[PDB]
Symmetry: C3
Subunit: 455 residues, 3 copies
């Protein structure tokens, strides 16, 4: 027969359970081919792509990436696609792994309010991307319309202690990175493959802080990793560890002991990890400006005993992770909501700047503003800042070099410009500094920073 | 000895036959090393890169990609390169697979009207890119100067039912995608790696519609896939199938059962496919905006019996392929030629818009303009369009949201802007709508759309 | 135990020797695990990124890439990081291959004047990138803060005749490629992944001409290849040869007989080469505009007997390598220093243009300016140039087409524009032509070309 043909379906039809990221449906745990029924519903909706930044996502099952599907090589899959009547657009699905033109696209076209169905046999074992396939295909995929389908080998995968679901995507907003408000899709930036954000699981901090993945020393972790694109190839990397194994789609070839691996646009791989020592392990795109300037990091946090003979050093902090070392940045969300209301208090700006000050500023000036005598001027009880706080907006946007004196000490150094910070971010950071460590006090508005930018 | 040394050439010299894409010279089918003579002639010439879009290609043997060369590991290759006296530039060749500095570049320098020769032994088995190697190398390669050379293993490749030749390239026009006329090379866009088109076999639709590759259910297909670049890496993908095998250059490593595979700039791979069920199978760069916005699709069309137990669904259509589902878009070519002549009739604009309307517009408004009551307003006998057809130019360029009434029915939806359409494309699409389904009639000029763009 | 655990350290502590690129520390040549002490010192300093182009590099041990580290799987590594008191910034290190959060980042934070230490066991065999891990991480990496660490298998690597150290990086200057002076870092270009230079070993010509790598026919060469990024993936290619072997990090999978191989951002591979025939072998990023327009070439020069039966052709020259065929371009460095001094002589401009004229101009007009009668007009004793030398600035910046007459011969051809040349480059090239082959003489200033650009 064809390969993957294990005969016709036995027993009762199975209604497939799909999971929201970062979780995975359990092993099918069976020795016979089945008829599997899949209900998947498209929903269009605003969600936070970043703190105080809203985006209209188009989703399979309400999430980016969309719901995870798990079947067995040889299963017969009756695939129903519903387009929720709130949707303004039509949608369909192309599943990689499907043998058939469009991988289902033609038979799955679905207007708002309608349901579609088509049937396919899962001939090919492996991990596979699925995505919308509706003109214009790039826009559907950029708005979040992708996920994974696992087709298990008949004997199933080897048992591990944890299975997780992580999917990278490149996103195209009209506004610049961390510009606040509802951000429309930007076709220009997408055609040019110049994304404003590059994200795991549909948002900045989706898998950092309180939202990290978890395992214990001695446990094995399997991650199903997708690249939804639409455009970027991922230099997919784990910081501080190594993958025991990396297997692309249903490839016969299996790479072992690598830390860095290229994932094509539309590609998917299964990686295996064994926790050897505790701490935060970062998943990134090692096209480093994606990781550190566009949101492309996810954390795996390991619990257990130190092993001083393998690694003597300290847990990850804000020197490396910057503002994502913290549990969350809800203070930024809260301050942004207040601006929209017109009820922005000084305390709102202070708790938001406190969040944003980590790494961004603390790497030189320290957590406590103390600085380092002769090398990094203090921000704590600072005569320099007191003397002219309006110049602090210029110092942040445009930088500072030359000899200067601060609390009667000489500095001849360089503070790089930080023009990438948005007006609200400069304002809140500075309002926190002024209201910390016995400084003058007061406040800096977004409006004040806008004026100084424009000169 | 060296590896690949099977002794000196036996028998008479063989004059090598080269094929034009997408065809491949036949298997050398011999057990002895030979002296192979290769005559390859460079030609500069305008060809259509897209409908009504002309480009000055620099070519090896009159095609992009250039003529395919097939020899045997151990052969001695006497390589003659002629530069046609019409050429304005000098040219040479670097063949990957050649052991020797420049892979032939120095000894093959050839001014217009001249012939060059150099001899090399084919030590390395595999599939290899060749390209021009003349300062400035990027310009020669961007203008189309690349192809493939197969060096067979001594026992030859395994027999398959079909062998085809597909080569991706990134192209850099002064004008934007589908801007009509003769388009010069743009050095700025090339240096920035921002291509206007991304193409298989030197043009949009080179391998779609009437120009698809063909096989029958049960047949094996081998594709020799090149990436000429100059700059892009291809996330090379088959929609709706799987590659039995992928082998890069003359690599010992062979990947099996993958759908998605990274091809480096200057890389080449051999993929094997087995037809299981009939329909169109799309080859793409799954950096999706290349595939769907810049021309990076090719079709393999399979004939034979449905297998309802493997795949129940319908053949690919314009929901997914958009305007390339059709056999061709000659109507666009014909209307563009008419504009240049100043003899553009209403019928010319109508048949051109009819072509362009598929997917672009039909995905929401339907093939027949009917729309879907309450969800997608009709274009068919439309009071809304009748009431002010000049506003239709604004609706296409800039989009439409809000409550509206069309043939006495309420719509509160969103039609995305389509500013990417060129003036001629908006004009012809709208002229087709006006002259279809009992609408007012009339015509929209490119000149009319230009004015509305500029406001 | 863990894998790589060969017990506790025996014998005396070893003080590790680190080498500057392109050299490599010798094999550890031992059968027991050791305690290895590593002293590495960060230095900030201006160096030439290109002729007459200065950049403030941040370096590990004074070089880009930074000093090479060589230890044995199972060694215990006491890692000391010093930040020289001249530094204006703090720094730390993340080593790929380290089992531990941040791969050392947290425990290695080091202000100007300070020393840090942390200890790790080398559990994982392979070749690994190390880099700075200090907010903002992208800037530290773009300024040159990366190198390699080899962790040998216990039995060591196989013996080869030569081992070399080559590392690619993408660089982001405010000024355009080969714009002269001290060039600041450009955050905009880095975030957009639009590098101005793409370099092996921290500069244009770092490994070309007099600075090429060397081997003899019959010798094996191992290259440790790094991609520091920060952003680019390398289509890493050897022109005119083949890699016997390519192995990524400590991967079990080993590819054999390939010419072209993708290296991820942050990736590293070990390639093996065997010299079969003499000549220059070029290492490139086959994203060709990096190689030929941004500095991404390195040369391996092989000495020994011709083998006419394998390759009949000539050594690489300026048709392919352009201005890098020569031993150096010191004349460009010397002329640029003179402009800064205000002591720029006619002879300074002539020797600088002579350097720059190779490939750029000589590919059509020839080394001697003779041209080719009827095809390429001469520059040698040229009536056309004599008649109006001020028009030569326009011809270079903007090109020339149409019928023309030169030394009483007709030409109807096309000379492409060369607007990419900087004002100083046009001026020096033209001053060389005027003062060569019995031409009028005189000089063209950078200031003259600036005026003609602006019209
Ligand atoms: C190092 C990498 C720094 C980062 C990150 C930030 N700052 Fe800084 N800052 C730095 C230096 C070396 C200097 C002195 C420059 C000189 O000419 O010698 C400064 C200076 C300031 C000042 C003025 C002096 C003072 O008030 O003590 C201010 C107000 C200041 N810096 C604020 C500041 C903020 C708010 C930061 C993050 C947004 C920030 N700095 C980052 C070094 C570095
Ligand atoms: C959905 C994804 C659409 C595509 C693709 C195109 N159109 Fe559309 N159009 C769409 C909607 C939802 C609406 C109503 C918007 C609202 O505010 O509710 C429209 C509206 C129009 C109109 C005006 C109404 C009418 O005449 O019936 C016109 C003239 C129109 N659209 C034309 C049009 C053309 C020519 C298209 C391709 C070039 C096109 N539309 C694409 C939804 C979608
Ligand atoms: C071919 C690929 C060329 C390169 C590279 C360069 N030039 Fe050229 N040049 C070329 C042609 C075909 C022509 C004639 C154009 C026509 O209309 O037929 C020219 C012309 C000139 C001229 C004017 C004629 C003359 O003086 O002989 C000059 C002064 C000239 N070219 C200079 C020049 C320089 C300085 C170059 C490098 C910087 C250069 N050319 C490159 C073809 C080509
Ligand atoms: O390994 N860190 O980028
Ligand atoms: O599988 N389609 O993009
Ligand atoms: O093989 N040369 O680009
Ligand atoms: Cu969709
Ligand atoms: Cu896909
Ligand atoms: Cu050429
Ligand atoms: Cu090449
Ligand atoms: Cu640093
Ligand atoms: Cu790293």
């Amino acid at each position: 027969k064809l390969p993957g043909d294990f005969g016709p379906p036995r027993g009762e039809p199975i209604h497939a359970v799909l999971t929201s990221p970062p979780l995975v449906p359990p092993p099918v745990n069976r020795t016979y081919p089945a008829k599997v029924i899949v209900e998947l519903e498209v929903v269009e909706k605003e969600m936070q792509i970043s703190e105080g930044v809203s985006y209209t996502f188009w989703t399979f099952g309400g999430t980016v990436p969309g719901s995870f599907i798990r079947v067995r090589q040889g299963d017969t899959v009756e695939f129903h696609l519903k387009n929720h009547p709130s949707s303004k657009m039509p949608h369909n699905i192309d599943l990689h792994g499907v043998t058939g033109p469009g991988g289902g696209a033609a038979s799955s076209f679905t207007a708002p309010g309608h349901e579609s169905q088509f049937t396919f046999k899962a001939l090919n074992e492996g991990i596979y991307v699925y995505h919308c396939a509706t003109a214009p295909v790039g826009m559907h995929i950029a708005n979040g319309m992708y996920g994974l389908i696992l087709v298990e080998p008949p004997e199933g995968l080897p048992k591990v202690d944890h299975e997780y679901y992580v999917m990278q995507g490149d996103f195209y907003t009209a506004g610049k990175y961390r510009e606040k408000g509802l951000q429309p899709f930007d076709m220009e930036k997408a055609i040019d493959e110049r994304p404003s954000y590059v994200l795991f699981n549909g948002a900045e901090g989706a898998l950092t802080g309180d939202k990290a993945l978890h395992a214990k020393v001695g446990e094995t972790v399997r991650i199903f990793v997708g690249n939804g694109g639409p455009n970027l190839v991922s230099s997919f990397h784990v910081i501080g560890a190594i993958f025991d194994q990396v297997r692309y789609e249903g490839g016969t070839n299996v790479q072992k002991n690598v830390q860095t691996t290229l994932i094509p646009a539309g590609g998917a791989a299964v990686v295996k990890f064994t926790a050897r020592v505790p701490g935060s392990y970062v998943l990134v795109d090692h096209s480093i400006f994606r990781a550190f300037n566009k949101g492309a990091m996810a954390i795996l946090k390991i619990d257990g005993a130190e092993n001083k003979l393998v690694y003597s050093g300290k847990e990850l902090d804000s020197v490396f992770l910057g503002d994502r070392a913290a549990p969350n940045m809800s203070a930024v969300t809260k301050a942004t909501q207040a601006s929209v209301s017109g009820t922005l208090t000084v305390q709102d700006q202070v708790q938001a700047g406190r969040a944003l000050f980590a790494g961004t500023c603390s790497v030189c000036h320290q957590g406590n503003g103390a600085g380092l005598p002769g090398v990094f001027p203090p921000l704590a009880k600072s005569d320099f800042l007191a003397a002219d706080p309006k110049r602090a907006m210029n110092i942040v946007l445009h930088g500072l070099n030359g000899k200067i004196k601060v609390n009667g000490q000489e500095y001849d150094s360089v503070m790089p410009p930080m023009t990438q910070l948005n007006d609200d971010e400069v304002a809140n950071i500075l309002t926190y500094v002024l209201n910390s460590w016995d400084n003058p006090g007061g406040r800096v508005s977004a409006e004040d920073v806008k004026k100084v930018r424009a000169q």
